[PDB]
Design a binder for this molecule. Structure first.
Ligand SMILES: O=C(c1ccc(F)nc1)N1CCC[C@H]1c1nc(Nc2cc(C3CC3)[nH]n2)c2cccn2n1
Length: 301
């Protein structure tokens, strides 16, 4: 297919500058755009591109995949701002998140270890604020009839002001490729982030997203260690399916671990919803959360 709509942006309104890094279809850049955020003449944006060698099938694929993001309008979900489908290079304009993916962010927080002072690990308040933002992006998606299937720190983005948001769907990368494993056929799956039921039948729901959310809290608490570190991909499958769980990270407040354990209930129906996760921590979120969140929006019921 490939049908241009109201998301179409004139190429002359875009300026690509520095590389952010490679995506599945090509290089992602930082840049500026005119008239993508209402009539703002200059908005710092992220620009997704298709490699110059790509085929017609590949460009149309990129446009249709990207286009799923058009439906969403949430402060805790990375925004699509525009599409450049007329002429080449094929572009998709998105909200810029200056601090990159949450897994790289958390790992950059680990001590350097060569005698210089270091910032103490994130406070429980800082962790709750990340949890609440992620959970809000996820509650908005669920209310919009979506099951994410790949919720993980590597798929959460960090803005200039440290706001965490659900990242652009299906971003491939290369850096976190070991976070995936194929037991079957077209089943290269994020096994260490999966619920016992999804590992059994390959079915994902809002409940299995809640399980992976608990894994994201553990990643936050461990500064993005590999979940089930001492185990091979095969051992993880058996260990999780048989009721095994991640250890309480060292120095992790019981309060944050209790929330992880709630997410990790063997029965999916016993796990809290994302609405329920937010309710339990709403008192702890920055006062601004009540004005920008899906949770506090008219759209929430
Ligand atoms: O880290 C990621 C990334 C993006 C989305 C996601 F869901 N998971 C990872 N990527 C993808 C390629 C470059 C690299 C990436 N992206 C950055 N910011 C982005 C990307 C986007 C939309 C265009 C994608 N908005 N802001 C960014 C800021 C600092 C370092 N990076 N690296």
């Amino acid at each position: 297919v490939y049908v241009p709509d109201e998301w179409e942006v004139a190429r002359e309104k875009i300026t690509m500058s520095r590389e952010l890094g490679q995506g599945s279809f090509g290089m992602v850049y930082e840049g500026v755009a005119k008239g993508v955020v209402k009539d703002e003449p200059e908005t710092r944006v992220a620009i997704k591109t298709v490699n110059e060698a790509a085929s017609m099938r590949e460009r149309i694929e990129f446009l249709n995949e990207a286009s799923v993001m058009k439906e969403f309008n949430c402060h805790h979900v990375v925004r699509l701002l525009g599409v450049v489908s007329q002429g080449q290079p094929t572009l998709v304009i998105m909200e810029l998140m200056t601090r990159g993916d949450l897994k790289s962010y958390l790992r950059s927080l680990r001590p350097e270890m060569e005698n210089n002072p270091v910032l103490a690990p994130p406070s429980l308040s800082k962790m709750i604020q990340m949890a609440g933002e992620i959970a809000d992006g996820m509650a908005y998606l669920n209310a919009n009839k979506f099951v994410h299937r790949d919720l993980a720190a590597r798929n959460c983005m960090v803005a200039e002001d440290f706001t965490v948001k659900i990242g652009d769907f299906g971003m491939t990368r290369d850096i976190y490729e070991t976070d995936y494993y194929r037991k079957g056929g077209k089943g290269l799956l994020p096994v260490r982030w999966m619920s016992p039921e999804s590992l059994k039948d390959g079915v994902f729901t809002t409940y299995s997203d809640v399980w992976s959310f608990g894994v994201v809290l553990w990643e936050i608490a461990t500064l993005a260690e590999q979940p089930y570190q001492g185990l091979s991909n095969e051992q993880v499958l058996r260990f999780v399916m048989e009721g095994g769980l991640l250890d309480k990270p060292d120095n992790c407040p019981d309060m944050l671990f209790e929330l992880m354990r709630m997410c990790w209930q063997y029965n999916p129906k016993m796990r809290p919803s994302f609405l329920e996760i937010i309710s339990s921590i709403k008192e702890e979120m920055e006062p601004g959360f009540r004005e920008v969140s899906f949770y506090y929006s008219e759209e929430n019921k």
